[PDB]
Amino acid sequence: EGRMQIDEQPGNAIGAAVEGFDHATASDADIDALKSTIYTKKIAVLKGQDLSPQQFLALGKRLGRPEAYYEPMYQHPEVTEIFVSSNVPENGKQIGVPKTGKFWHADYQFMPDPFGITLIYPQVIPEKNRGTYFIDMGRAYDRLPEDLKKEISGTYCRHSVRKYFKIRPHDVYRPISEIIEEVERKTPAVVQPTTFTHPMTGETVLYISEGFTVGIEDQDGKPLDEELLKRLFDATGQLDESFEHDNIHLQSFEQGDLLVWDNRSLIHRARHTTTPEPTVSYRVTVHDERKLHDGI
Template sequence: MRITAQVGRALGVTVEGFAAGRATAADIAELKEAVYTNKIAVVKGQELTPRQFLALGRRLGRHADFHLPVYCQAGKFWHSNRHLTANPFDLSLSYPRAVPTYFIDMAAAYERLPNDLKFEVRYATATYGVLRYAELGPRDKAQKLADIVEQVNARTPPVTGPAVSKHPHTGETVLHVSEGFTMALQDTDGADRPDLLAALLRETGQLDPTYQHENIHLQAFEQGDLLVWDNHSLVHRAAHNAAPEPVVSVYDE
């Protein structure tokens, strides 16, 4: 197995010679180490059936079923998988890949924040939910707005958690703020801080309509590429609207 840095890119490595069906425990450990160190691994030359894809996910960690509600189109905004909880997945895999994807390393983005924003968010509490990007289906439109909100919150209730935490595998400080799912921030006094949330989204690059912000990494793909990324520290979004691609997310335990 050969692992090389992506030339001219701040994030990511290319992995060649990885055989999912024959990978040893050492191969799996080396792949995971490459992902945690470099955030993204593009594994070349894969020909996986859906069953083989799931089997590889189980070898990388404890698979947890994850299905976004149909009323939330996650490819249209910045998010991480399971960002609707205080415990995002560690790793995500997607195969096959066709649609280019934007990524932001929220550990590096935190380090680049102005010192005043770092101080303000370090002990803040975040509230996560789906209402900002919830989309109505045909049957929903016949209901009262209050009933729709109640239904959405019943399916995916808002949760709270620290806005900043240590990465469980690298020890990095990670900012857990996403355009899609962070509904509010509260400071240590419990006061709502919409100004702080807006500033963090702007400073990390999530409000840049040109995608030219220094934090944003565009990852392209070729046929046969398998993508593995550090879901705990990256937020992502599709480069353009497209049908969802198969994703498996796992807890690395």
């Protein structure tokens, strides 16, 4: 320690900037303060980071236990634990996967044991159409009409990667039903409480996303009409294709920025592809000291 400085946005405004962060020398109290900032301000932007893939993973290890993405075509060639979103060929070759996350989601929401913190280290940044959209789903919950809160009290949601699973080079010439069935076998839909208590802040989080949440079920386990999910998506801002809804936060960044955010509370998505500008980003996803929620 001796130089890390966190500047939190005032009041209820989302976000914080962190200057002078060096993951190799930060103290234990520094890391604890940074983590408190992530859980309360939801997005911490580390400034002036110039890291190799190896150093990026080491930074993530300061915060928690990294997990490699379960489909290895997304993995960085040198560091299995880095997820690569890229549409810039490297010597003509495709590294990682292009056009990822073009839908509202929380990371690993379709898995039984989602990690609590996501780190994004942008490498190639669109000049004009840059940034990632975010919605804080605890704040979104609080802003729901009281009756809508009542309607989802006691319900459960099913989450699945089945809509957005990407065809892999190995899948060419396979019948489509075989892949559909493989996805159900490898990543069966996961049931979660529709709302859960955030272990670090105590706040109630509405844990749904247009991208991964495929059904809602009652406190007896019987499916409810998906019109309820549409009304929740609509109320929380996830159906607004203009991205002007009051819940929506556009997070921009510049070279050297490294975003760390609360993957319990937030959902995020890429912007519309309104320009041909490329994107390359490295992702590290870590488990912190608690499960997603205490029922996991």
